[PDB]
Write a protein that binds this ligand. Sequence first.
Ligand code: HEM
Length: 394
Amino acid sequence: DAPTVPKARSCPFLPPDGIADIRAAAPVTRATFTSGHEAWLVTGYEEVRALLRDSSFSVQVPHALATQDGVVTQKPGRGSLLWQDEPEHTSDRKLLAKEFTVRRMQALRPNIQRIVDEHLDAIEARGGPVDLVKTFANAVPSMVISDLFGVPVERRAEFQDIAEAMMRVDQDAAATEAAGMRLGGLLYQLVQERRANPGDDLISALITTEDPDGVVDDMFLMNAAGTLLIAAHDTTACMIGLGTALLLDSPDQLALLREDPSLVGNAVEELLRYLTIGQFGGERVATRDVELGGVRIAKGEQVVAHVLAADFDPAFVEEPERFDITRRPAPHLAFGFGAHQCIGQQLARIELQIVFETLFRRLPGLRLAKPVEELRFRHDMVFYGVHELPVTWH
Ligand code: HEM
């Protein structure tokens, strides 16, 4: 009856205490997870990469281990990617990737600058103190996605409100469901409206993409839009909030940043590694027997890629436990690895670069409004973060 995965953090910016010792002894081991099911726990950097690169592992798992019951909820179909296996994941990712290009993401920089400035304009008009989460972390990323999707500015308010409601988690089952149906309704109308009046947005591009093959219908488009939005919003928001929190709690690194603004890119990469916000890790099931770190994984067995522990493997980086923005960026696993690796990562990087540069330049002497020990952390969420971040500035 294998030991329960360490979850408790005596320091909120750092991993659960017990994890380092498991990683040093047994980087592939057995554990009991939050559902009460026992699975393979993979904590070593090399092992977690080998696991994520191995296309023997399916993403269509028998148990949701991070959850109270082992119950894998309702899954989306073609175009949603997250729960697809090859060959259909892959060809559908390929279709998506044809239009959701890194070129298209780079082309969104002016948009992101504008959105970031608009939100800061609003923050500075009010003073002082504000909740950065509500007013900035949760708002910017969904607005970036609405530009990606061609949403005109008159339509932003509704999109923002619907995206936000979808995201929040002081909510019972029905409220949660209601928020999802309100979103799906919005995206269905958005799809129709792009079919009527195409534009230069991602959805209009997907509508006319080359589709041999017959697969891009309204359903496929709704699944892709919803997954892009969902995957892009809470993750980026968590990074903005936690990354700001960790920087404000790290006046040493922040000083290095103010002394040398060219460190923003490296800061963003060190923040990604340091926070690895997918705190519980990628869930896979073997579809054949596989050998991983000398240990044999049977067909049908479930495995949890603990990307957070891997991002602190001392074989990955030296003194993994210092938060050091001067590091030359290493290949962290915050965006995953292999076939399911974050498709929007170049966009997330651009957003975070613009956010952190603009935030610290525009609000100099930004400062926590309460102590760090009073902040409330996202203990049980798929994405780790803070619920609120009260701050003031000059
Ligand atoms: C800000 C930080 C973000 C993090 C830390 C993150 C993390 C991830 C991870 C860890 C995966 C792999 C999941 C797994 O292997 O189980 C993934 C996939 C995905 N991400 Fe991100 N993401 C972030 C931002 C974004 C943005 C801006 C977008 C999209 C516009 C995005 C869109 C997606 C999509 C559709 C997938 C699934 C890809 C597939 O399954 O083939 N993410 N993300």
